[PDB]
Amino acid sequence: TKSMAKAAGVKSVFAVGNTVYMTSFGRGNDAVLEQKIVDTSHEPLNIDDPAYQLNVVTMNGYSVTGHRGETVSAVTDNPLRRFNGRKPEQSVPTDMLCLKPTLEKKFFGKEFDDNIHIQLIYNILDIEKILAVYSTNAIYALNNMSADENIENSDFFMKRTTDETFDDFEKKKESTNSREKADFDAFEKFIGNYRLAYFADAFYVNKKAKNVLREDKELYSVLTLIGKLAHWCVASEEGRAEFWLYKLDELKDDFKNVLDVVYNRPVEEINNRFIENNKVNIQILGSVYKNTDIAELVRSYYEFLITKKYKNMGFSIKKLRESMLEGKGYADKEYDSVRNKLYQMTDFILYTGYINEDSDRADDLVNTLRSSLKEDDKTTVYCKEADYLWKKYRESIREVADALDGDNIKKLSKSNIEIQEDKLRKCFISYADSVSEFTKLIYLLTRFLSGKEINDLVTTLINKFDNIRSFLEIMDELGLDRTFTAEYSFFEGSTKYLAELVELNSFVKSCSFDINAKRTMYRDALDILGIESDKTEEDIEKMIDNILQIDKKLKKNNGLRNFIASNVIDSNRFKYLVRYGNPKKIRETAKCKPAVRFVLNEIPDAQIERYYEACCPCSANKRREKLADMIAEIKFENFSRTSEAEIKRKNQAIIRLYLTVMYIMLKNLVNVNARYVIAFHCVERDTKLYAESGLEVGNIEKNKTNLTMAVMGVKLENGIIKTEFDKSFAENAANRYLRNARWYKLILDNLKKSERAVVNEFANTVCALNAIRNININIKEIKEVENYFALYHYLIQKHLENRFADKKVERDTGDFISKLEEHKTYCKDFVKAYCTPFGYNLVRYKNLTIDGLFDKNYPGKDDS
RNA sequence: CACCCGUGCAAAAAUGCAGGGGUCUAAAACGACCUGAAUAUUUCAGAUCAAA
RNA sequence: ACGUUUUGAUCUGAAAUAUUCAGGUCU
Ligand SMILES: [Mg+2]
């Protein structure tokens, strides 16, 4: 649960050399430091405004007392006495991988004698553990635009590298090699693909406006640049290529020129056509003010609208105007085509209220709101304040409202601008020249993934570049060494990368479809749904032609031909699934009932009661299985009369829930796969780390378990392990995880029964995503799925035994395929056998092999 | 309902007590004023669509 | 042949709720 230290105000307890600093929470997540402690003699910094006083300063515990919030007193622990409790009891603590000195020399110049540096090293390593989950399912989406309906095992995107340009990859067209030629033919297949129009914000250039493809010069410049990033988050790539993203200024002329255009077209759409796109709105606001100048009006309207600097004021204007407009004249039925613009002009006029005129009323209001004894005062603090405020603005928003009828907005929208402002151009969100190549690269990463996880990419990169900056204002405040090595100096600019990415968070939206892609989006509807036609592929797009017949002039009374052109093309959930899953594969993925019936457990109770009532004319256990076997056998007509029409209505009303079960299932089986992408990156990362720590590891591309042996001193000698157990190995392991005997023991037990060859397949199964990229074959017999750890591993234990269906395997592994198939669930002992390569890191090894310990949200029970 | 660490206690190898951990995993950070983003419902208005 | 009235769907706009990620404040 809670930790009473950080509830008492102690941020972190740094230890340098002999003394022990101790920090606290600044404004936000920057660190002010409270007091150093040389032993039992504390010198307090930060004299005025203390965050906590210290009571009993022992040799081991630092009992503090804090007065932020309700005043709690907690005891912290001496970092110098860590690992030295029962033995001279004063030393700096190394990290539990016992790789702290190598990590310090590798990023900075030399070793150190603190732990302020190594808490910063584990936040520079950490932006691979949160960028391999958002760069894998952005390359899973691109691998499902092949639509191969087969065993898919290609390697197109991880083959890509920015070591070559386009013009020499162009020379692989007429190439002579039997594998280089196929890759350009794999590229010819991909630029001639029509499903690139799904990602039109990064593949289409605006040139009314008729946007078309990029050149082959630049489509290669996105697929390579998004392909190198996925290959960098899965593997080692010794040399400068390991330091790839940390020097993105080393890219060629092409890749900056594609980052400088994929970033400009949303930032020039929002600046170069701002007054044009708000011309109907600025002219209202000029008419209601008439005393300010319109050049600074569109400045303070721009800070209100999109930049959103000064919009946070501690009181919700979106609730404030509604207590103002409760029961007033603007709740009519006529204003409903106006409330898009009426409610944001009304909101803006209050925003200029609480800046220019009565800004002193706002601080009165915020201080009022922090004294809520109940909630009922809040609905009469605003309504009391709106009772004042409508007396001020009722003439003004009437002048707005009568100027917003059905035809004034037509005649206002046809005027010439002639506003010619340069006070506005100061506060523009800046273009692609004064923003870095990192921000432009993780911009282009957010052009391939959904809106729930743009907001988790470019806010966990707000946080990590702010928890790197805050350490660089402690060890720079304490005079410690800070200069990174010159081949790694990316993070001096983490003060401005925090400033670029906050600017990036202000305007990123989802990757917009284009208009002229209905015809290929409609084709990828009927094979999600299984409405296949017996005619050939070159003779069914004319069906797609004559139903759409362009944007939409669909025929009248055409039945299900134009049902699935009106609703399920323009629906939200379909736009998520066809950018994500394989189109012509995920109907027969949905045919397994117990995988589906699992997935709508964590689909909410208010969600299923919308669809149970849409299909049945009552308990949520048996309500869910009533329509889990309706999503599975969905049925549509091929390409009495009451029953055969009402079964269509119960198949057309489940079509949104079907289309979101196959999204949540087909996503969460690669958020689980990205746990093993992290692990197989953090094994090839620790190979070049432990090999420089004087630990003779050896090769790892032949055998992935070589690190977790060479950490624990065990070796093969004739093809298997004949170095069995005693006590003296556990004291000589090169890791603080493998010190204790039983955790050394059972990893040694599991390592002796895991062959080399099945791990090398499990290597390029989680990295090229082949466990789920052809999921429909691998899921065909489930007896029961209880959690996504089980559903992932049965999908990965079949893919082994699908390939080890002819090859010779030894008896220890060959038990597990029999244990896989005498049941139909996954084999809980086989799942720990090939998960060993990342078994040197014990807490990664336990949390990635037993469900219950796997998931943050779903805690369970250990194995023992 | 994890792993490591420290102190306290019984014991010889581990468990109890309360802790701490950004240097433990994907995972350091109370609470209540908001903001940005999207989830999912409900109500209203609207425009298409299917069927009766 | 041609218009209905309903029902059930999508979507867009507004409001209400709950969840999640992040930072803006404050004690
Ligand atoms: Mg960490």
Q: Are A777 and A148 in contact (CB under 8 A)?
A: no
Distance CA A415, CA A279 (A): 8
The rounded Å distance from CA A99 to ligand 1 centre is: 14
The rounded Å distance from CA A125 to ligand 1 centre is: 9
DSSP assigned state of A95: P
In Å, what is the separation between the CA of A714 and the C1' of B22? 32
Range 842-861, chain A: CB under 7 Å to any strand B atom: 842-844, 846-848, 853, 855-857, 859-861
Classify residue A589 by burial, with Cβ atoms within 10 Å: 0-12, 13-18, 19+.
Answer: buried
The rounded Å distance from CA A118 to ligand 1 centre is: 10
Q: Which residues contact A740 (CB under 8 A, 6 or more apart)?
A: A730
Q: Which residue is nearest to nucleotide B24 (CA to C1')?
A: A843
In Å, what is the separation between the CA of A335 and the C1' of C14? 10
Q: Is the CB of A27 under 7 A from strand B?
A: no
In terms of Cα–Cα distance, which of A502, A506, A505 is closest to A465?
A502
The rounded Å distance from CA A121 to ligand 1 centre is: 9
Token pair belonging to A696: 């003779």
Distance CA A387, CA A391 (A): 7
Token pair belonging to A192: 């001639």
| Residue ranges of E strands in A577-645 | none
Please provide the size of chain A in residues: 864
Token pair belonging to A445: 């990463």
Collapsing DSSP to helix, strand or coil, A47 comes out as coil
| Cα-based distances in Å from A15 to A21, A38, A50, A480 | 6, 10, 20, 12
Classify residue A45 by burial, with Cβ atoms within 10 Å: 0-12, 13-18, 19+.
Answer: middle
In terms of Cα–Cα distance, which of A793, A835, A825, A829 is closest to A814?
A829
Distance CA A26, CA A23 (A): 9
Distance CA A125, CA A687 (A): 14
Distance CA A706, CA A700 (A): 6
DSSP assigned state of A490: T
Helices (H) then strands (E): counts for chain A: 37, 11
> Amino acid identity of A596?
V
Distance CA A465, CA A127 (A): 9
The rounded Å distance from CA A471 to ligand 1 centre is: 14
Distance CA A730, CA A515 (A): 64
DSSP assigned state of A84: -
A463: nearest nucleotide, CA–C1' criterion: C22
> Amino acid identity of A568?
V
Q: Are A583 and A622 in contact (CB under 8 A)?
A: no
Report the 10 Å Cβ neighbour count for A550.
10
Token pair belonging to A439: 């921000």
Per domain, the residue ranges of chain A are 4-92, 94-122+466-494, 124-270+430-458+508-513, 275-412, 518-671, 674-847
Q: Which residue is nearest to nucleotide C25 (CA to C1')?
A: A314
Q: Which residues contact A339 (CB under 8 A, 6 or more apart)?
A: none
The rounded Å distance from CA A13 to ligand 1 centre is: 15
A574: nearest nucleotide, CA–C1' criterion: C10
What is the experimental method?
cryo-EM
Q: Is the CB of A123 under 7 A from strand B?
A: yes
Distance CA A450, CA A462 (A): 18
The rounded Å distance from CA A122 to ligand 1 centre is: 6
Q: Is the CB of A498 under 7 A from strand C?
A: no
Q: Is the CB of A27 under 7 A from strand C?
A: yes
| Residue ranges of E strands in A678-717 | none
Q: Which residues contact A781 (CB under 8 A, 6 or more apart)?
A: A824
In terms of Cα–Cα distance, which of A825, A832, A837, A833 is closest to A850?
A832
Count of alpha carbons within 13 Å of A215, Cβ hemisphere only? 10
In terms of Cα–Cα distance, which of A180, A201, A203 is closest to A191?
A203
The sheet carrying A75-77 orders its strands as: A52-57, A61-66, A75-77
Report the 10 Å Cβ neighbour count for A300.
20
| Cα-based distances in Å from A862 to A632, A676, A853 | 34, 20, 7
Distance CA A616, CA A613 (A): 6
Q: Are A567 and A655 in contact (CB under 8 A)?
A: yes
The rounded Å distance from CA A129 to ligand 1 centre is: 10
Range 557-596, chain A: CB under 7 Å to any strand B atom: 557-560, 562-563, 566-567, 572-573, 576
Range 250-309, chain A: CB under 7 Å to any strand B atom: 308
Task: State chain A's maximal CA–CA distance in angstroms.
Answer: 92
For chain C, which bases have at least one atom within 7 A of a protein Cβ? 8-16, 21-27
Collapsing DSSP to helix, strand or coil, A619 comes out as coil
Give the pairing type, strands A212-213 and A19-20: unpaired
Q: Is the CB of A117 under 7 A from strand B?
A: no
Token pair belonging to A720: 């298997």
Q: Which residue is nearest to nucleotide B34 (CA to C1')?
A: A314
Q: Which residue is nearest to nucleotide C22 (CA to C1')?
A: A459
Range 312-331, chain A: CB under 7 Å to any strand C atom: 312, 314, 318-319, 322
Distance CA A439, CA A490 (A): 12
A778-790 burial string, b = 16+ CB within 10 Å, else e? bbeebeebebbbb
Helices (H), A694-783: 706-710, 741-751, 756-766
Distance CA A216, CA A205 (A): 13
Backbone Cα Rg of chain A: 31
Token pair belonging to A747: 């990893």
Bridge partner list, A62: A57, A76
**First vs last C-alpha separation in chain A:** 23
Distance CA A497, CA A438 (A): 8
DSSP per-residue letters across A204-244: EE------EE--HHHHHHHHHHHHHHHHHTT----STTTT-
For chain B, which bases have at least one atom within 7 A of a protein Cβ? 1-7, 14, 19-42, 45-46, 48-52
Q: What are phi and psi of A470, to 5 degrees?
A: -70, -25
DSSP per-residue letters across A277-319: HTHHHHHHHHHHH-SS-HHHHHHHHHIIIII-SS---SS-HHH
In terms of Cα–Cα distance, which of A433, A103, A412 is closest to A281?
A412
Residue that has been written with the tokens 């992935």 in this structure: A704
Distance CA A126, CA A854 (A): 19
Q: Are A632 and A592 in contact (CB under 8 A)?
A: yes
Distance CA A114, CA A480 (A): 10
A857: nearest nucleotide, CA–C1' criterion: B27
Range 767-796, chain A: CB under 7 Å to any strand B atom: none
Q: Is the CB of A18 under 7 A from strand B?
A: no
Distance CA A839, CA A853 (A): 15
The rounded Å distance from CA A119 to ligand 1 centre is: 8
Q: Is the CB of A602 under 7 A from strand C?
A: no
The rounded Å distance from CA A23 to ligand 1 centre is: 18
Q: Which residues contact A234 (CB under 8 A, 6 or more apart)?
A: A132, A136, A158, A677, A680, A681, A767
Range 125-184, chain A: CB under 7 Å to any strand B atom: 126, 129-130, 133
Count of alpha carbons within 13 Å of A349, Cβ hemisphere only? 27
Distance CA A200, CA A194 (A): 11
Q: Are A165 and A252 in contact (CB under 8 A)?
A: yes
Distance CA A517, CA A198 (A): 7
DSSP per-residue letters across A99-167: -HHHHHHHHBSS--SBSTTHHHHTTTGGGTTTTSSTTTTTTHHHHTTS---S-----TTTT--TTS-ST
Question: Cα dihedral angle (A514, A516, A519, A520), rounded to 10 degrees?
Answer: -40
Return the sign of the alpha-carbon dihedral for residues A745, A750, A756, A759: negative
Q: Are A55 and A42 in contact (CB under 8 A)?
A: no
Collapsing DSSP to helix, strand or coil, A446 comes out as coil
CA A456 to chain centre: 4
Task: Provide, for chain A, the percentages of residues in helix, strand and coil under a 3-state DSSP scheme, each rounded to the nearest 5.
Answer: 45, 5, 50
Token pair belonging to A299: 């400045």
Distance CA A554, CA A742 (A): 70
In terms of Cα–Cα distance, which of A565, A594, A639 is closest to A794?
A594
Distance CA A382, CA A525 (A): 48
CA A194 to chain centre: 26
Distance CA A81, CA A33 (A): 21
Q: Is the CB of A459 under 7 A from strand C?
A: yes
A498: nearest nucleotide, CA–C1' criterion: C23
| Cα-based distances in Å from A452 to A63, A456, A729 | 42, 7, 47
In Å, what is the separation between the CA of A495 and the C1' of B19? 36
Distance CA A386, CA A365 (A): 11
Token pair belonging to A63: 């009992």
> Amino acid identity of A337?
S
The sheet carrying A35-38 orders its strands as: A15-16, A19-20, A35-38, A41-44
Q: What are phi and psi of A605, to 5 degrees?
A: -70, -30
Distance CA A541, CA A335 (A): 43
In Å, what is the separation between the CA of A653 and the C1' of C9? 6
The rounded Å distance from CA A88 to ligand 1 centre is: 29
Classify residue A571 by burial, with Cβ atoms within 10 Å: 0-12, 13-18, 19+.
Answer: middle
A68: nearest nucleotide, CA–C1' criterion: C27
In terms of Cα–Cα distance, which of A391, A421, A385 is closest to A295?
A421
Token pair belonging to A137: 């399912």
| Cα-based distances in Å from A436 to A246, A270, A309, A569, A805 | 11, 19, 21, 37, 50
Q: Is the CB of A600 under 7 A from strand B?
A: no
Q: Are A547 and A555 in contact (CB under 8 A)?
A: yes
Q: Is the CB of A311 under 7 A from strand B?
A: yes
Q: Are A267 and A307 in contact (CB under 8 A)?
A: no
